[PDB]
């Protein structure tokens with residue numbers, strides 16, 4: 021049939037998608053700026069489609085309810101036919117790969133630890149061996165699932181603590197996790213992907229840092245409904261953009277050229 | 284060959300696939316050891332197939348000959364139907380993705396610089412701005428194509444030099460590039476993926492090192508012929524093995540530092 025505007029699901033998560041200055045009087049895609057706004061424009065150009073950015077209704081990345089088996093987040097919007105493509109920092113995982121299609125990675129990353137500067141923690145092992153400093157993860161995504169499923173002793177011990185900690189150590193949005201680190205006087209550390217950890221380390225008031233090595237090695241992919249004809253062209257576009265240096269340029273633009281914590 | 288046996292193409296490249304000691308009295312898959320030998324056994328177990336390891340006939344990763352337009356290397360073995368799967372440090376690239384299928388990555392890496400210790404080079408930019416120290420890449424693979432196609436000023440400058448350097452700065456095998464660094468008294472640097480660079484830096488004679496950051500961010504994938512029924516299960520197996528920690532365990536085994544250089 022005739023060309024139709026592609027519905028892009030994405031998530032309001034800095035620096036991937038942010039409200040532009042003057043958004044209150046702007047419409048459509050012009051309301052937004054950021055790494056995934058730029059990436060969406062590049063993918064659409066290389067693939068020959070028009071598109072509308074739409075922020076995921078529930079603000080989640082995507083997980084499957086263990087009881088109902090219903091998917092939420094951006095994954096659910098693809099699974100249930102509400103969006104045509106997700107262009108976001110959506111981690112490629114086994115349980116998601118089983119229900120949606122993914123491009124090859126457009127970013128490489130791993131789970132990491134964010135501390136308030138001066139916190140006496142250097143590693144996940146350190147966190148697991150003490151109780152004075154609380155720690156947690158984002159809800160409804162791949163980091164929480166990593167700990168829930170891990171059979172590695174250190175990560176198992178961490179999950180056993182996190183799942184029963186009171187008050188809850190889990191947060192609904194990345195920003196809430198950052199705030200809890202910044203306000204907790206060193207008594208909360210946040211488990212989040214290295215990409216975001218590195219971004220926040222370059223934002224005022226420059227009071228957080230990444231410690232330890234990454235816990236795993238994975239990637240973000242552009243996602244489509246399973247079997248969508250759109251997947252092939254999108255994947256070729258990701259590989260071309262990576263090989264041309266454009267993805268490295270975009271990361272540098274939004275992470276380091278715009279950094280607030282000096283040169 | 285025997286029915287129901289998956290033919291695996293792979294490449295003799297340490298520590299991915301190596302001949303075992305006393306391999307001459309061994310037979311079949313038992314001749315070989317290494318990271319990709321272990322990975323093949325894990326993938327085959329998860330996917331439920333029997334398999335035969337074969338070393339790629341021409342010893343190449345895979346490129347399309349510009350004149351004949353025929354694919355060589357492991358890519359060619361898949362394209363022309365001589366193998367059912369490639370399990371090797373085969374880089375996921377655009378031109379390869381157009382002709383074969385790839386799993387999600389099982390290893391993440393980038394192009395890097397190997398020098399003989401003491402060489403006054405810290406970066407690709409450093410290489411591009413001088414002519415005393417020669418430098419080159421492997422033939423018939425993704426690193427040479429990266430420079431050939433790049434429009435980044437530094438990399439374009441490097442390609443313009445490399446393509447016309449005499450004698451040739453390109454080598455037929457990774458080992459030959461490493462040997463050239465070691466024998467050239469600091470007057471040759473070698474452009475190769477970080478995985479191998481890091482492996483060699485920890486091994487005797489302890490005379491090479493990696494300098495600078497990686498030039499790109501890429502991955503190795505398990506490859507199958509386009510549309511093969513094997514691709515789906517193989518991809519799910521790679522993701523499961525990564526999530527169980529087994530890929531990191533295999534890396535830590537085959538990159539294990541026994542202290543050949545320094546204290547270990």
Ligand SMILES: Cn1nc(O)c(C[C@H](N)C(=O)O)n1
Pocket residue numbers: 081082109110111158160161162163164194211212213214215216217
């Ligand atoms: C920074 N950061 N940390 C996380 O856990 C996430 C979400 C993840 N990318 C997903 O897809 O669930 N993002």
Ligand SMILES: Cn1nc(O)c(C[C@H](N)C(=O)O)n1
Pocket residue numbers: 344345372373374421423424425426427457474475476477479480
């Ligand atoms: C160490 N190292 N450097 C390279 O260039 C290679 C080959 C590459 N993985 C390909 O697929 O062509 N391997």
Ligand SMILES: [Cl-]
Pocket residue numbers: 023024025
């Ligand atoms: Cl429309």
Ligand SMILES: [Cl-]
Pocket residue numbers: 303304305306307
């Ligand atoms: Cl022998």
Ligand SMILES: [Cl-]
Pocket residue numbers: 434435436437
């Ligand atoms: Cl440039």
Ligand SMILES: [Li+]
Pocket residue numbers: 116117118119120121122
């Ligand atoms: Li999938």
Ligand SMILES: [Li+]
Pocket residue numbers: 379380381382383384385
């Ligand atoms: Li492909």
